[PDB]
Amino acid sequence: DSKVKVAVRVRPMNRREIDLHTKCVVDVEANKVILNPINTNLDARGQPKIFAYDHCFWSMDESVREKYAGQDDVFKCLGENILQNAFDGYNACIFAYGQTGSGKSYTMMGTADQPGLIPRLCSGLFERTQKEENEEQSFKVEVSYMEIYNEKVRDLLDPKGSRQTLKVREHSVLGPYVDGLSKLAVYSYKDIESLMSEGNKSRTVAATNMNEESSRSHAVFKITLTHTLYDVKSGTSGEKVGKLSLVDLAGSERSNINKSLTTLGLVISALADQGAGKNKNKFVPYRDSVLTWLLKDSLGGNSKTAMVATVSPAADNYDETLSTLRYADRAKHIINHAVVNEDPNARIIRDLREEVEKLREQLTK
Amino acid sequence: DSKVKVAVRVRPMNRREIDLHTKCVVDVEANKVILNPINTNLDARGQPKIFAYDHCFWSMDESVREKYAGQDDVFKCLGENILQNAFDGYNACIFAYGQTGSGKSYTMMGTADQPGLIPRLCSGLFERTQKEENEEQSFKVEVSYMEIYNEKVRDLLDPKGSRQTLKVREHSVLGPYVDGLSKLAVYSYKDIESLMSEGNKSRTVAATNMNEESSRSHAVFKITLTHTLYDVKSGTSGEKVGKLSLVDLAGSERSNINKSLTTLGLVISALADQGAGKNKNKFVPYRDSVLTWLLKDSLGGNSKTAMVATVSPAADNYDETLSTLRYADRAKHIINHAVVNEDPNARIIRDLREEVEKLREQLTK
Ligand SMILES: Nc1ncnc2c1ncn2[C@@H]1O[C@H](COP(=O)(O)OP(=O)(O)O)[C@@H](O)[C@H]1O
Ligand SMILES: Nc1ncnc2c1ncn2[C@@H]1O[C@H](COP(=O)(O)OP(=O)(O)O)[C@@H](O)[C@H]1O
Ligand SMILES: [Mg+2]
Ligand SMILES: [Mg+2]
């Protein structure tokens, strides 16, 4: 049904890079990222490398106004389509990918000063449900917020704070799920903000003494939007469910602390190959890690998915940037199979009524 | 499908009645209530009047142990069947009826020292969902808590506390409902207790200066139990919904402050008549008051309903007791039509598959 949408975001030079006048090797021109060489005297390897994507966000300098992508520009190019996907009854996923320090969290959650995709999405969601609820349609919103570290799943909304690990299980009806994960109804922005906030503090309390290892953890924020449509002249109603998954991955740079990230690289490569008609018979190793298992639908399954690859423009990060740019490039060839999530009984009934009519007129003979 | 179940509960003498050695005119023998005369010299009107009910709770004296019904006895004879009705996917209603001071609130909600039907029901509900959840079945619980006074509906769980009044509307899919009423998910006893508690304080803050008028208000506490059954070998699932309505009516004794109570008396009388085959063509005046409108299903509709008629045993209350005893008597002839509340599409599909098979073998000719 659709291809994975890919955006790249170039963060500003950090404070060390400004002190040192570190050179910028990343240029953005419309939807092209140009990775310029570090070693300017080479006949290959010292040439610019040019990549094309669905979206490019140059976020290097607030001053350059004809070029700079702030937080709301990201939201208007990526967030709004994803919110519309959920309101249409599709599962939708945005995940941020890139080396530690390149801007994954700033993009997904942002700061109190510069809220990112998740709080903007939350606000717009409740704005829209408030404006569209009436006697033909109602809405229910649920939230889950989990962390994956060292292949163990924790509930960031846990009431206790034991930080105990949750089993991941397969279910013929639900699919892969986290057995025990809180799923909480929310009724306004402020409900979902208080959950966002408790989960973010549990991400940061998990990072107090283990700062190097908090760059190795994945965070998944999940909104379930249940749209009820009332067929008022037939006295019936039905549900369409869209699930919004906002994913803040572990740092992509160089025991099984990285099993999920590695497995994700494999999953992306296999799905990209398959989109280009290679290795069509090779099964995708979703099952080999907790993260790719839990998010199997988001990549090559029943989901409308966008990737925000985040990169440093600094010469010192060239190799990690190239690799991020290459994965994003592969990712834009992944074919997804998003369908509207409504009850199958209605289609079964329509088909059966059609078969009844076919039989009835066959009987006329 | 079922008749309205009726219990009577006889409260103990209050402090004034003990001071004055007020005589007891109510006796209980098995399921019979005997209303003995006040004027002992009369040839009718000064004879005992004997009524039979489904249950009789003599709650006059904790000391008499072979006879006394405490709060858990009430819950085991009435609460447990109602909880089982909800778990089976029926709507279920308990309402308390009787003069001010006779024990309606003590029976429905009780005191911190003697919790009544509602907290006991809540606790047992979450006990049962915790023990029965597994991979074939999950549960969702929602609560609403409203007050009706002078034909106006207020939300006892309102976050603001404006005490603003809510419109009651008709809906072809939902039925009569309160437009704007909070309906909140709860996940443990303590969630639903904090809501119970905020609602009870909003009942009592509404009674600070208006104590005589708080005896004129109705309170409705509503739990929605959504039972999901997972058909794991077919990869499908479905919902059964039971709604639990616990109703604490206004005082039954002698402008439209009493419109709902009067209309309820009419509704009970018409439905009792109809059960005994009288006035079969006379429509029941559900629509003439907010309370009977909102609870139309509980009386003569899709509900398993029990009435707790509460009475004073004191001679001074004879006339009000007789009238309470008479309404309870009428109420036990009300026929209800409770069905299991599941999705109708499954029956439509079964019938259509049967029709397909009938046609297919007719075609063999
Ligand atoms: N586009 C941006 N604009 C301004 N500041 C940014 C941007 N991206 C990142 N930062 C800052 O850089 C720091 C590291 O970014 P962060 O999002 O934590 O990276 P990651 O989560 O990928 O490790 C943060 O303090 C953030 O405020
Ligand atoms: N069965 C009972 N046992 C002990 N005390 C009771 C009983 N019924 C009522 N009471 C007490 O009598 C008082 C009035 O009862 P209440 O339930 O408020 O009556 P109502 O709600 O019908 O006006 C309460 O303070 C309650 O504690
Ligand atoms: Mg981060
Ligand atoms: Mg009361």
Author numbering:
A (entry chain A), B (entry chain A): 3 to 44, 48 to 259, 274 to 384
Task: Share the article's original sentences.
As expected, in comparison to the autoinhibited wild type, both the T192Y and L397F mutations significantly restored the ATPase activity of the MD-NC-CC1 fragment, while the T408E mutation only moderately restored it. Because we could not obtain sufficient quantity and quality of UNC-104 protein for structural characterization, to further investigate the mechanism underlying the mutation-induced activation, we performed crystal screening of the three mutants of the KIF13B MD-NC-CC1 fragment. We successfully crystallized the T192Y-MD-NC-CC1 mutant and determined its structure by the molecular replacement method. The structure was refined to 2.3 Å with Rwork/Rfree of 18.2%/24.1%. In the structure of the T192Y-MD-NC-CC1 mutant, we could trace the electron densities of the motor domain (with bound ADP-Mg2+) and NC, but not of CC1, possibly due to the intrinsic flexibility of CC1 upon dissociation from the motor domain. Although only one molecule was found in the asymmetric unit of the crystal, a MD-NC dimer could be formed by a crystallographic two-fold symmetry axis. This demonstrates that the T192Y-MD-NC-CC1 mutant can indeed adopt an active dimeric conformation, mediated by the NC coiled-coil. Upon superimposition, the structure of the T192Y-MD-NC-CC1 mutant was very similar to that of the active MD-NC dimer, which also supports the notion that this is the active conformation of the T192Y-MD-NC-CC1 mutant. In the autoinhibited conformation of the wild type MD-NC-CC1, T192 sits in the interaction interface between the motor domain and CC1b, while in the T192Y-MD-NC-CC1 mutant, the bulky aromatic sidechain of Y192 protrudes from the motor domain. The T192Y mutation is therefore likely to introduce a steric hindrance that could prevent CC1b from interacting with the motor domain, which would ultimately activate the motor for processive movement.
UNC-104/KIF1A was originally identified through genetic screens in C. elegans and is the primary kinesin motor for anterograde axonal transport of synaptic vesicle precursors. UNC-104/KIF1A belongs to the kinesin-3 subfamily, which can dimerize and can be found as an inactive monomer or a processive homodimer. The current model demonstrates that the activation of KIF1A involves the relief of its autoinhibition, a regulatory mechanism found in other kinesins. Previous studies showed that the motor domain of kinesin-3 family member KIF13B could interact with both NC and CC1 to form a compact self-folded monomer for autoinhibition.
